[PDB]
């Protein structure tokens, strides 16, 4: 149809700072025209594995709305971001649903998020009472006490602080290097057809 203003695909993929994985951010892309060419043209990235659609033909189809997320994770565990996988971030931080129709993008950031002394701006949750229903965020910082005696906000055996801090260093191997991840989640109900890419006539 009509409408020509480009979607803000540069505010998310060029942002200097990415929010930590435990408290991720949610962005709405609507009322614009998408341009997926730039994504795989400019950025040298790996693992463009998308679910529910072939990466080649994202231009022809029209979509209802686009939801953009973003965070940073460890290198060896990037495979955990997929339905049916089990892991610390999958169980406690970010869980994908069984029925998913969208893509994931992951790229290395060893030249951005690496500190000689050690980065401490990125944190992940380590343990929780139960799993998480898909698309849920947590900001809780209260102590989870596994001991019978109530620690009640103190430090002691059988009690641990829920959060743990990453520490990225240039001397680490490729396995532990940080990776920036952005997931795009779609829905193909195709009633309004508002936010789809370029087509003529």
């Amino acid at each position, epitope marked *: 149809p009509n409408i020509t203003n480009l979607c803000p695909f540069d505010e998310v993929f060029n942002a200097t*700072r990415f929010a930590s994985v435990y408290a991720w951010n949610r962005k709405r892309i609507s009322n614009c025209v998408a341009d997926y060419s730039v994504l795989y043209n400019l950025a040298p990235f790996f693992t463009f594995k998308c679910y529910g659609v072939s990466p080649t033909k994202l231009n022809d189809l029209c979509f209802t709305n686009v939801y953009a997320d973003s965070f940073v994770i460890r290198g060896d565990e990037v495979r955990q971001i997929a339905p049916g996988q089990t892991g610390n971030i999958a169980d406690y931080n970010y869980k994908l649903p069984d029925d998913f129709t969208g893509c994931v993008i992951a790229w290395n950031s060893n030249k951005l*998020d*690496s500190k*000689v002394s050690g980065n*401490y701006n990125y944190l992940y949750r380590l343990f929780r009472k139960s799993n998480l229903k898909p698309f849920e965020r947590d900001i809780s910082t209260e102590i989870y006490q596994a001991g019978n005696k109530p620690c009640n906000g103190v430090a002691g055996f059988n009690c641990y602080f829920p959060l743990r801090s990453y520490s990225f260093r*240039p001397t680490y191997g490729v396995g532990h290097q940080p990776y920036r991840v952005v997931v795009l989640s779609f829905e193909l109900l195709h009633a309004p057809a508002t936010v789809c890419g370029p087509k003529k006539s």
Partner: antibody
Amino acid sequence: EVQLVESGGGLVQPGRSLRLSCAASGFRFDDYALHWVRQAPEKGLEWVSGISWNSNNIGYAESVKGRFTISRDTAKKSLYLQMNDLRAEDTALYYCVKDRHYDSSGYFVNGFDIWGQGTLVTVSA
Amino acid sequence: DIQLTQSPSFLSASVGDRVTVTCRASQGISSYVAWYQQKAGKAPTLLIYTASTLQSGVPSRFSGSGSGTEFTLTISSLQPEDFATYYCQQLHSYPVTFGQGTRLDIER
């Protein structure tokens, strides 16, 4: 255009405090680290202080540590370097600079991009 | 901490020549180094970062190289506005340290 303005400088005497103000415009204040630098006349350059994006990593020079206070406020887009126990050694021109990658130092990409015109501070008996 | 030394304190040159400034460190700082140019009575501006990557709006004549504890800044061709002062900066630790400064002069 990105602009930084320094104010509050002038002449003081030893043993008295002072305050400055580095107003910023033209860029998002909350996604960049800032530093305070000083330069003596015809004596090269010298670093004074720096702050992080969320005021979590602060570093001072030995000869300067324990005497001054750096503080950033995002409400008014301001950076303040509160002064204490001045001597004649601190008479210099002060620059307020903005780092480019939201954190102090150690990262691969770092550099002082935009430098303010600075203000003159002299201490004397 | 880590000390940095400018090899030429002052260096005379003429238009269209080749010049090099050697900023030598004490410890191995990998490639966390930068260079700055200060005009006559003006606030210094950035020239190069990581000694290899041009930042923005900088003439292609400027270049940099180095590794370990040695760095060099290269000017392919000299221009009348190139007469200024040059500083080198460490970026490995947290007490940052600037070089003693290199001043360029006309040749006559």
